Design a binder for this molecule. Structure first.
Ligand SMILES: *[C@@H]1O[C@H](CO)[C@@H](O)[C@H](O)[C@H]1NC(C)=O
Ligand SMILES: *[C@@H]1O[C@H](CO)[C@@H](O)[C@H](O)[C@H]1NC(C)=O
Ligand SMILES: *[C@H]1O[C@H](CO)[C@@H](O)[C@H](O)[C@H]1NC(C)=O
Lengths: 198, 181
């Protein structure tokens, strides 16, 4: 009912002005109900040592982390507890987090605007969605539109919402119904909105 | 790395400004972190915290552990320091911009190292106080960093914004400009 964690391991040898950083990542990777664990330690951008469940032991990514590897791998209790993580910590958090994380669904808001004179464009602005997997499609009087379209890259707002812009190439006729269409794991029926010029 | 989803505790410790932080990430979005002054777990989204708790001490512990480790490696490296990688900075709205209609400006700062920053907003020259919020120094795959600075505003007709940013990888404090059409 609470997120489990993992104490980091102590390094070996414990017994603009200056700046040093030391980072540690503990990454869980989920595939088909499978779970693979990765514990890395970075000094100042340089990842020096690392544990991969799939390897079963540590590797010295740079000579800088040689002392940790030798120590840690001749330590049976350490190893046995790393190996456990895919099932202890990873499983627990993955399963615990589910509803708010894996089952997170946010309805996108859709929006269609000109932007012309002085080329000619029509932005379909799709804001506020999670997850980031989205399809966005253009229609002129019902019929699809490949040519003249530009998708921005998927842009992470970094508040657990994504944003995206898909503009179309313009040649407004007379009775033109230009429809932007979106699809997402949240809304089952594909939301659409359109535009005319009179 | 052939995965469906990624959950990682990332935490760093450094000798300058941010004495170091500890957090959790789920697919590059940050879930909860531990406020080291306040000694509490802080949940990014309100509904997260109301769903499950997390032991604030555990992060505190690891932060202490990493403080330690830092010193060890300060040794076996004759105190080596990486050089400062400048930030790539963009600014864009949260919602489609429109005539006098409540919105939020986002200042995304990318690809920088180390994570020491001064970031401020300028609205027609003026430094803004109210309306400002911000993410943690987020850790990246490539051991670089990025941050988000948030400002809430109303799209005025003639009216500009610059995102003023200081970091050692620069010397020109860089500001990206921003406005409507
Ligand atoms: C690190 O220590 C060795 C001691 O043998 C020395 O040769 C070298 O000058 C030191 N490196 C730096 C960058 O000071
Ligand atoms: C942040 O601001 C202070 C102002 O006194 C300055 O001394 C410091 O160098 C600044 N840091 C960066 C990284 O620009
Ligand atoms: C995961 O499902 C795949 C099909 O994509 C299959 O090969 C396998 O049975 C599953 N994985 C494992 C490790 O058993």
């Amino acid at each position: 009912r609470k997120f489990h964690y993992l104490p980091f391991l102590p390094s070996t040898g414990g017994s603009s002005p200056e700046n040093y950083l030391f980072q540690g990542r503990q990454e869980c990777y989920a595939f088909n109900g499978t779970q693979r664990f990765l514990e890395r330690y970075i000094y100042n951008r340089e990842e020096f040592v690392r544990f991969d469940s799939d390897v079963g032991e540590f590797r010295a990514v740079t000579e800088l982390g040689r002392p940790d590897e030798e120590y840690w791998n001749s330590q049976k209790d350490i190893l046995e507890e790393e190996r456990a993580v895919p099932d202890r910590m990873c499983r627990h958090n993955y399963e615990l987090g589910g509803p708010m994380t894996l089952q997170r669904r946010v309805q996108p808001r859709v929006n269609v605007s000109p932007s012309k004179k002085g080329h000619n464009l029509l932005v379909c602005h799709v804001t506020d969605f999670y997850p980031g997997s989205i399809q966005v499609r253009w229609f002129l009087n019902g019929q699809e539109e490949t040519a003249g379209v530009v998708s921005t890259n998927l842009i992470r707002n970094g508040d657990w919402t994504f944003q995206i812009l898909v503009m179309l190439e313009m040649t407004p006729q007379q009775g033109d119904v230009y429809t932007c269409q979106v699809e997402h794991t949240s809304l089952d029926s594909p939301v659409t909105v359109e535009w005319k010029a009179q | 790395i052939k995965a469906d989803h990624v959950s990682t505790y990332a935490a760093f410790v450094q000798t300058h400004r941010p004495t170091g932080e500890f957090m959790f990430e789920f697919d590059e979005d940050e879930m909860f972190y531990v406020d080291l002054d306040k000694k509490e777990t802080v949940w990014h989204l309100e509904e997260f915290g109301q769903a499950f708790s997390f032991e604030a001490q555990g992060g505190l512990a690891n932060i202490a552990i990493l403080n330690n480790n830092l010193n060890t490696l300060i040794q076996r490296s004759n105190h080596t320091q990486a050089t400062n990688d400048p930030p790539e900075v963009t600014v864009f709205p949260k919602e489609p911009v429109e005539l006098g209609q409540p919105n939020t400006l986002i200042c995304h700062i990318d690809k920088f190292f180390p994570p020491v920053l001064n970031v401020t907003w300028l609205c027609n020259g003026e430094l803004v106080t109210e309306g400002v919020a911000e993410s943690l120094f987020l850790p990246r795959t490539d051991y670089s960093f990025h941050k988000f600075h948030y400002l809430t505003f109303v799209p005025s007709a003639e009216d500009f914004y610059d995102c003023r940013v200081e970091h050692w990888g620069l010397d020109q404090p860089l500001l990206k400009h921003w406005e409507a059409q």
